[PDB]
Every structure is written in C-alpha cells, then in structure tokens.
C-alpha cells in the first residue's frame, strides 16, 4: 500500500534535485541547496534494474506460429492450429499486460517506502534537537552549519553534541 | 535553520498504468514493446531470400516453362511466395500431398538441381513431342522442365521402358512423377496403346503401381484430360526402379535436398525485397529494436521480440512525478 | 475531549481466501464466477437454431425420407443434434470424410435446396424403382431424397450415362453421390451389368473415379450390400461432369451454401429449443450474467464468460470485518 | 506486509460508521458521533474499482474449444485436441485462482495502510497537544469544539493556536 | 534496565532469488523442484512393464517368428521399446496406419491370443509352404505367427476362398491381414493365377478391397516382393467375412483387446527393468519425491510432479539471515 | 516494500534466539535473556505455511505430453504437437520461475513488517517511561524486573504505575 510519503505528507517533488531520486534540502547561515542521498538512490537503481532485467529474462522465450497450409479437407486440423496460436497469444498477452499493471504498482510503492524509510532514518537521529513539522521538514533548535548538515546526510549526527544548546532554546521559547 | 527530505521530479510527461490508477506520470520508465517496422524483406545471416516472382511454389519445383528464371540450384534464408502468381500447375490435375510438400521445402535450406533420368534411359519411345498447349511458353506449346511426357512411337508401339537410380549420394533426393489420364479411349490408343497399361515405381520403402482412369473432365486450359502428380523422397542408400508400359510422366530433373538446422519460413506477400540486412524478418516487415515484445506480426524468421496484442507495455522505473 | 481514528465494520459473513489465510470475513466482496444456467436453447442475435429432431446430421443433409420436415431451406445460428436420433444413414455403408463434413456444415449459416440433376438427365436407364426396405417411408421401401439410385433398364443394357451442371450461380454448391457395392457378382450383373464398371466424377479442381468392390459381407438392416457415400463442394464458376456405366448413386438434389461470418457450433444435446433470446448459449444451457467465469461448459456459441474449473472466485473489495 | 493498523493497535471496527470505510469518532461537551473520512474513502474506492475493472478487462478474452469430431483412425489428433483444450483450461484456472489469492491479500493490506496513514495524518498534526492512547484515539490537552474537530478532519489543525493552552496543563 | 526487539538468525548459507536482489541468504526455505532419478523401470500398481526386447512394436503384434518369447497373453502397465531391436517387419512392405496402431496399443492393458482362422478354413489351396528366408524361425525359413501365407495349387486353380468369424465374444478383436505383391508377372501367375485377383474384407462397419500392385523393386532382406500389411478392430457383435481369389495374407492368430481406463505409455529407452515398485515412472527413470516440480522428463506414466526447465525453485519461508 | 526494520534500524539478527522468528532481549538486575514472541511468530508461521501450501495446491495439475509417432507425410501435425508441448512448457516455466521471484520478495517484506509492528507495539506502551535508542532497544526510566519485562512482552505493561518513578529521572 501507500507508505504516505510521496504525494502524501510530503506534498510535492523537487525539480531542483537532479542527481538522484531521494534526497535533502537544507537551510543554514551559508545558504540553501539540494543533495541526493547516493546510498538509497543507488540501492533503488540496483533493485529496479534487477527487476526489469528479471522480467525481460522470463519473457525470453517465444511461442512461434508458422505458415503451414491446409486443404479444404483439413478444416479441423486448420482450426486446431489457429485456436492454438490464438491460445498462446492470449496467454502471453495476459501475462505481460497484467504483470506490468501489478509491478508498476509495486515499483511506485517501492519509491514511496524508500522515501518513507529515509525520513525515519533522519528523524530517528535528530530526536528532540529538531522540530518535526509533519511535512517532511525539520527545524533545528540550534545552529546547524554545513558540516552539521553533512553529518545528518551521512547519518553521523552527534545528538549529545547539540543537546544542551537545544534545551536552552526550548526553555526560552 | 532547517532540513527537509524530498524526492525527485522533472519535466517528464511519459505515463504508465497501474492496477489502482491509469495515466500516471512517472519520472522514468521503459517501453518493452516495439510497434515499428520496415515494410520490406532483407537478408538473414548474409543470405538473400528466394523470390518466386510470378511463379507459385508448385510451379517452381515442377519447372513450369514460364519459370525459366528460377531454373537452377536455389539457396535461400527464407522463401517468399507471391499472392497473384500465374505460373503454377499449368496442365490440369492434382498434386498429391501438396501441403506436406510445402512444409518440407519450407524446412529446407538449399536444393541442387540435377538430371535423374536422362532421355536415353527410356529406350524405344518418343521422348520428344510430349508437349501441350496447356503449358505454353510464349506462343507454342511447352511443358514442365523436371518432367518428361513420354508417348508412343509413331511407327510402332510403346514397349516396356525401365529406369533405375541408386542414391549412393550424399543427400536425400526430391523427385516428381505422374500418371497421365487421357479424356477418351482414342488418345489412350494413339498415345500409349489399347491393352492394359501400368506405371510402376519402387524403392526399399515405397511400392507404387497405377492404371489410367480415362474420363471426360471439364475443360481446363483446353484439356479434358488429367495427370496425377506425385512427389517423394529417395533416401540415401535407397534405389528407385521405374517401370512402365503406358501413361508415365517420368522424372527427369530432380533435387538434392538439404535440411535446415533450424526452422525456415515461407511468406505470402507483396512487399518489395531490398538490399538490406535484418536480424529478424517478419512477413509484414523488418524489426530493429532491443525491446522484448513486438506488435507487428506472429510470423517471422530470425530472432524477434515476443508477439502480443498490446499497444503498449511500459514499466515504470522512476517514481510518481509531482512538480 | 477525544478523537479516534477507526474503520468500518458490518453484519457481513461473506468470506474470501487469501494467500496467508483462508476463510477470512470481509465487509465487501464480489463473486466473479457464474455457475447458473437455463437448461434450454435460445436464439443467438435473434436468429433461431436448427433442430435436427429425430434425424442425425447425416440423415438430414443426405435426405433420409423420414426427415421430410427438414428437407427445405434452412437458416440457423447453430445446430443441435439429438443423441438418440433414429433417422440417419439408413442404407449401410460409410460416408467418406464424415467428420470434415460436420465441421463444414457447422461453419454454415444458410443453405438452399434445389434440383441439381433431374431424373431425365440419365438417358437409357431406370431412374425409378431405386428404393430399399432399409430406407422406409411409411409402409413401403424408399431411398434418400437427395440421392438417386439408378439401375439398368430391364429390356436393354446400361449405357454410359452422363450429366453436367454449370455452377453459374452466386454461391457454393454442396452435393452428394455414392457407389453401390453388391455382395455377389449375380447382383452386380442383375442391377448394373458384367465386365468393368466405373463411377467417374470430375470438376475443374476435382478428380474422382471408382469401381465396384464385389464381396460377401454381413447383413446390416437386412442388407448385405453397401454404399460408399461421398460429398464435395462445387465452387462458384466450376462445372461437374458425371460419367458412369454402372453402380452409380447419382446426385439429385443439392444445396447452395452460405458461409458463417464468425464461428458456428453443433451441439449434441436433449435440451429443448424455445423462442427466447440469449447472448450466451452453452451446450449445457443458457447463461445470463455480468460475471467473468463459469462452471458449466467449455462449449458455447455467442459471447460467454471464460470457462474455468473453479467453484468460486470472489475478490475482496472491502476490508476485514471485525465487529 | 501487514501495516498493523486494522486488527492491530486499532483493535476493532465500527458498526456505527456507515457512510465510509475510514473515519473518526469524537466527543465534545457539544456531543459525540461517527464521521467517515470521505477523502481517503473515495481514493480507496477509485483504486479498488479500477483494480477490479482492470482484472475483469484482462480476463476479457476466452479460449473457446469446439465440438469437432474424430474417427477411430484419428486417435492421435483427437488426443492432441484433448491435451490442448485441457492445457489452457488448467492454465486459466491457475491464473484465476492464484490471482484471487494474491490480490485479496493485497486488497486487504491496502485498507490496512490507508487506516495507518490516516492515523499518522492525525498524530503528526496534534503532536504534544494531545495524548496518544496508542489505540487510535487521542485525548486533547485542551478543549476542542466541533469546529476544532473539523480542522483535524480537514487536515488543517492549528498547532501553535493551542500550544500555549495545552502546555500549561502539566 | 532495557528491553530490545529483534529477529532470528542462524548459520544458514542457503540462498534464494528475489525480484530486487539475487543470491540472498535466508534462515529458512524450501526447494520445490526435484532433479534426482533412479535410472531404471519399475512396477506401476504392481503390474510389470512389457519389455519388447530385441523386437520392435510391429514385430511383436504381427508375430515375427523371432519374437516367440512375446507371442502369448500380455498384461502390462506400460511398454518399453528398445532403440535398436532387430526384429520388426521381417518381410518387406509397409504397415498401413502404423502410428494409429501404436497409439491403440499404448492405451491398452491386456491382450489375449487365440486362433482366429484355422488353416483348415481355406479349402482348395496350399495353406502350408507359405514361408520366407526374410522371416526365419531358428534354422529354416518361416513367416509371421499371426498371418497366413496362401499360395496356389499346382494341381488345381486358385479359387475364391472364404472365411467367417463372428465375434460373439466379450471383447474386441485386433487382427491383421495382408496383400502380397510379386515383383514380376511370372511370379504372380505361378503363385496365384493369370487373371485379375482380389483380396476383399468386410464387416458391419468396414468394406475393404485390393488387387495386386506389381512393380519391379530393389531387394530388401533378399526379397523383391512386398506385402501391404493391414489391421483393424472387430467390435463385439460384429462379424468378419473374408473373401479372396489371390494374393491373400490371411489372419491366423489374433488378439482379444481390453482398453485401458487411464493413460498408457510407450517408452524408448535402454534402461533396465527391475524388481521394484514406483508411483512415478518417467522414460528417463523413477522419481521418488514430495516436491512439486521435476527436471527429468516430459514423458511419464504414473502421477508425477510438473515438468519445468528450471534448475532450482526455492521459496523463502524464513527471513533474511543477518548474523 | 521494505519496512526498514530487518537489516534496517535494527541492524542485525540474534543467533541467540532459537525458539522463534521474532522476539525480545531484556536486561535487569535479575539478569538478561532472549525470548521469542510466540504469538506473532506463530501467526507468521501459519501464514507462510499457508502460502506454500496454496502454491503447491495450484501447481497440482500438469500438462502431460505423450509419445505418439508421426510419419514424414504428417510433418505438419508433428510440428503442431511439438509447438504445443513446448508451448505449455514455456508457460509453466514462466509461471513457476516468476512466481518464486515475486513472492520471495513478498515473504521477506512480510517478516520485515512483523518486526516493525512488534517494535511499534512496544513503543506505543512504554512511551516516555523509556528512552528510544533508535536501534530497537528501550532504556527504562525506572526499574523493570522480570514481572515488569513480561507485562511488556505479554502486552500488559502498566504505564501509569511507573509514571512517577520515571519522570523524576
Ligand atoms: C423387388 C425387385 O426389384 N427385385 C426382387 C426380385 O424380384 C424379381 C422379379 O420382380 C422379376 O420378375 O424376376 C426376377 C427374377 O428374374 C426377380 O425375382 O426378387 C428377389 C428375391 O430374392 C429380390 O431379392 C431380395 O432383395 C432383398 C434386398 O432388397 C430390396 C430391398 O432393399 O428391399 C428390393 C429393392 O427394390 C432393391 N433395390 C433396388 C433394386 O434398387 C434392393 C436392392 O436390390 C438391394 O438392396 C441392393 O443391394 O433390394 C433381400 O436381400 C432378399 O434377401 C433378396 O432375396 C429382389 O429385390
Ligand atoms: C480546509 O483545508 C483547505 C485546504 O485543503 C483550506 O483551503 C485553503 O485555505 C488557505 C488559507 O486558509 C488558502 O490560502 C487556500 O487557497 C485554500 N485552498 C486550498 C486549495 O489550499 C480551507 O480553508 C480549510 N478549511 C477551514 C475551515 O480551515
Ligand atoms: C488517459 O485516459 C483516457 C482513457 O483511459 C484518455 O484520455 C487517454 O487514452 C489516456 N491517455 C493516454 C496517453 O492514452
Ligand atoms: C458455363 O460454363 C462455361 C464454361 O464451361 C463458362 O462460360 C461459365 O462457367 C458458364 N457460362 C455462362 C454464360 O455463365
Ligand atoms: C550469484 O551467484 C552466481 C553463481 O555463480 C554468480 O554467477 C553471480 O555472479 C552472482 N551474482 C548475481 C547473480 O548478481
């Protein structure tokens, strides 16, 4: 099902982020910018590429009709052949068309889950040093420079480092 | 200071269908089905097709006199048969196992034409003037180039004639013969004789003997007579004994036959052949793609993507595009 | 003060099966499979079926004298034959390529009955009194109403007889003939004549010739004789030449024939035909549904849902019903 | 993949909510009542209707056997027909029965997710202005009238409006 | 104080495939495909197979003198034919409808051998001395043990001969006869007579007739003559009338036949039959498994798992193994 | 459909827990130990057992080819037979191989969900009486003996009982 991130609590996408599917936007004293998460984006590429290659690979064989001819005294054998050729045609037509529908659904849900997980992975670190705005954004209770932002992106944010400063802005507001 | 987590979006308008929603724009996708074709025939594995031109397939292997263009060894990748070919079985009668014959030749790669039974084989008879207005070449009468119409000598009668071919050779041999059925007793007496007449064919695996069915039949190319056409395979090692005292349409030129390692094809089409190469050739045209499915035709030679009825089969690889 | 988030529940006891759990109750679902039928035949697109009644399919097109009701013009959507029809091939013998004939007629929509060869066609022979106790109409002996039994004239001899039918007509022609085979030479001489006898049929595309095979065989329906029944199609434009000096069961009435645009069917069933409409007709009965699958039959005419072996195919649309 | 909402931390359904699949129950001094969330309910209906129509549409074609007959010297082609007709019957029987099993699972999980997201949609809004009882219910640390309840439903809950009042209740 | 939530892990190195990742180690899984086989034949439901040994299928039912071991009552579960059996149709000629006959025997369970037409049936002819070097039995020349070679008497002409067999019996009868074709007319006159000769067979449902088709043919097993071999089923209640004036290879011993209720099989293999029991017997060997799929053969007789091309079909049941 | 628990924020498995797929590890003054959650483990087992049995049941039928023979004048129907038998063979192979890939993904995603949900079941109870370390572990702001631990495991944790003791820390 929907994991509620894409077109969910995160209402829209970013045309400003052009080096990846999943990523970050930050604002600090030096400015703002987009940055893709190279880990999760690459993992998504490997899975979906594998998914596409696996599907193509299972579609590798072909049923091959032929152009044999039949006399007017072979109507039955003629009809048998046709119903066979049409038979396997309807079967593979079905298998392909239905698989596309079902796996498109999975693929779209997959991105949603990956964004969802990434949002959690970040939320889990900042804890109460940041404000969860509910829209996929976090407001820091402290001063967070480029290196600070970097640690968050790389997953190495140091919570106790900024803990005291944060409480003071929550005891002054 | 703040940080946000978000997802990609771009200018894409390419759409896919899901089980829950249709026409959904995604950032990245891939079409799996090809629907484009070159309306022409090309070469398969550096081998040109054989165009039968204004000749049917029967007309070519029997040697219809108006198919002189095709009278040689033939080596093809696939065979293309033309929809409105005039030149087939010119002299009326039925070819036994016609459809099985097409299926055999279709699974063939190469045939070599040679003389099986020279006219000197048949001593005591008129090997010339065995000709008919029903098989014209230009104005005057002619006849099949692989078959010999044998009629009685004007001075004397038609004696037993004999032929033998031992296939000590490399490959299987495809040959053709017939039995002539005059329309009235007059021609039987005149061309062959009054007594009981027979056509005898025999190998290690075949036994063939027939007599004439003299009958008035509707006119076809001015002919109330008929000839029953026959074909068979003389296996390597086997030996053909031909014996007849009447009504024999003898084998004359035949074909050494080569089995194709894979399956071959015979297309019925008006499409122009050109000087081009194809990895996969359909009866409707050429496909050039890396895609996995096709839209154009179920009948093809080479390596084509799977044929389905779909108009589009597009996998989404990117994500829901929300600018 | 409070607010809660919750989901629907109701009185449903309808269940579905899942991959992880069976017999799971859901709030809303839909059965996709239909298993109900009206055990009767109806009209397809407002065109009635052909009831062959107490006649077999052979009996009807050959014209078994006890099939008189059906010996006329017929236009159908499908044909239904009764399992225990008495009236079939009354005079012993086999109909050659019988099954190929059923499939052709099955692919038929409309036939028109006419006289191909009047009894006056056959000069020099007895065209009446060609009847048998094995083919009775009421009390006395009779014979097929589409075929003519010809025996020699008492006074003279049986001469070569000939007939010709030029199919200048619109449509294809379906006709029937036979060769009678007496059990002993005595009967051969009496009915037809000694020496060599032949039955010869010919069109621009057909060549047929046969001879009597006189042999002592067991009695069937009080008859030790046999007739080999034959059928063929006279193509539009073509011409039939009949030639014989003995043993001919001649064509008499035949059928102009109309091909069906889609596929037609022949059902073998006891179900009653009625004046009703159906979009879906199975050999087991009529189906009326919007559902996608069936239990009743693989054999049908019209537009039916797909046949499967399943007893139930119910998709869940609602959610787990948890009161 | 069960999402843990339906038959999960929200232990049971509501026979009292009859105009939708997903919804709310509230209590005020102004009263109490059920109300379905027509937003997620409509999107769920559209998806499932599309899902069912799509499945019906791909089952549209039919393999249709015929009643042609064969002689006793045509045993082989007769059996050939038989093995073909039985072949596709077994194939479509398989495709139908297995798809129902797999997509029922998907369908049921879909609702589960929709409930989960809706609950999350509310939790994310109320934040520390409400007490998360863990069973899908929320107790307000302030007084929340009918118009207040609506904002939660409309997805427009105003957190800083009541932050002051709630926090004072320690 | 603390509490943690976690998942199982173990020493497993077994891997499975997913759609997103290959070679994935999981804690618990199950293989669905069996690829192991016992290269031998066993008993299906405690009925031994029929080993045709050094005889072909034709050779056994025709009764080739060198198949004496097999000429008796037989009850089998399936038949195994050895690839290079010497003893088949010993006297040159073709068996008509050979493949339909093979398919018939395949659907059989048990046959009963009996003498259909004793040699005393055929009065006025030499019912002895009908033997050939191409069909030797032990030391001297011989002939099929189910067929009777009949030649003319020097003293008297070869007259019309007749035989009758009424199948009042329980079961169907499978019998065989033939028509002999001498290579030259001299031998035709010597063995049979100088006129037109015929072999005619007839039942309530069959009509059969032939004449000699004499032709000069190559030597096969030292015999330039041929026999056209024929078979049919005499239904219960039916009656066989045999009538011929020459060239008849008569039925002599035949078989009462019982149809198999289930599926039968004919395997082409070198594998040893042994003293064992099996639920699943493939042409490639025995399978003993609970798994759902197989790799060994598409051809089997018992109740076997589905055949696929896969090398491995392993479902994950446990979870991703992360030590 | 990754739920981010298995090989996610819970980085690794427990070779020490041998009586179930899903479970617990605790630490108190009374000791430490592993314990499977017998409920959710059993529900998963019944489900997975059902999945495998359902698949086996739908694969029960077989296309069964035959060994009938054909003359060289029956080339066409011989070729017809071949293309049919190979036809269905390719069909079940597709059905068999693709099903293994797609549902293995599902099976593993399922376990991931079960771990995530069980973790949620614990967090929802403890709330602010415990510290969420982010790795699937909780540190209690109070003293939690075996009886305390079990209530967490049995799903009967008493939040207000320990509220006072916890908040002081
Ligand atoms: C009735 C007829 O035309 N001939 C029967 C014959 O009567 C002849 C008599 O009228 C004439 O003056 O003199 C000659 C002698 O020179 C005859 O006596 O008498 C025979 C007595 O044995 C009858 O034979 C019987 O035929 C039966 C079979 O057939 C019937 C039938 O099917 O009912 C009579 C049908 O009229 C006839 N159909 C024809 C000729 O087109 C058929 C037909 O001959 C055979 O069915 C074809 O094989 O036969 C019984 O078989 C009975 O055992 C036999 O004695 C003459 O029918
Ligand atoms: C219910 O929510 C909608 C948004 O979904 C509110 O409508 C928007 O209100 C803002 C400011 O209040 C406007 O700037 C937007 O233009 C409005 N429309 C949209 C589509 O965003 C609506 O006001 C809310 N209702 C109440 C009673 O608060
Ligand atoms: C979108 O949906 C409708 C029909 O389903 C129509 O506008 C159009 O065919 C669809 N879009 C495309 C690109 O086919
Ligand atoms: C009658 O047959 C002739 C040839 O036999 C041909 O012109 C056509 O089929 C018919 N003639 C007419 C004028 O219809
Ligand atoms: C998986 O294992 C196979 C076994 O040899 C190997 O060939 C392949 O490279 C591995 N990795 C894949 C398939 O990604």
Residue numbers in the entry:
A (entry chain D): 1 to 173
B (entry chain C), C (entry chain A), E (entry chain E): 1 to 323
D (entry chain B): 1 to 170
F (entry chain F): 1 to 169
What's written in the study?
Receptor-binding specificity of HA is a key determinant for viral host range. Two H6 HA proteins, one from each group, were chosen for structural and functional investigation: A/chicken/Guangdong/S1311/2010(H6N6) (GD H6) in Group I and A/Taiwan/2/2013(H6N1) (TW H6) in Group II.
We used the pentasaccharide, α(2,6)-linked lactoseries tetrasaccharide c (LSTc), for X-ray crystallographic study of H6 HAs with human-like receptors. In agreement with the weaker binding of GD H6 HA with 6’SLNLN as determined by BLI-based technology, only the first two sugar rings are clearly visible in the complex structure of GD H6 HA-LSTc. However, the front of LSTc Sia-1 (atoms C1, O1A and O1B) is at a similar position between GD and TW H6 HAs, which means that LSTc Sia-1 is higher than LSTa Sia-1 for the front in the receptor-binding site of GD H6 HA. Careful inspection of the structures suggests that this is probably due to the different interactions of GD H6 HA Q226 with bound receptors: unlike the strong hydrogen bond between Q226 and the hydrophilic O3 atom of LSTa Gal-2, the hydrophilic residue Q226 disfavors the hydrophobic C6 atom of LSTc Gal-2 that is placed directly facing Q226. LSTc in GD or TW H6 HA deviates from each other at Gal-2: LSTc Gal-2 in GD H6 HA pointing towards the 130-loop and 220-loop, while LSTc in TW H6 HA exiting the receptor-binding site from the C-terminus of the 190-helix. The cis conformation of LSTc in GD H6 HA is significantly different from other HA-LSTc complexes.
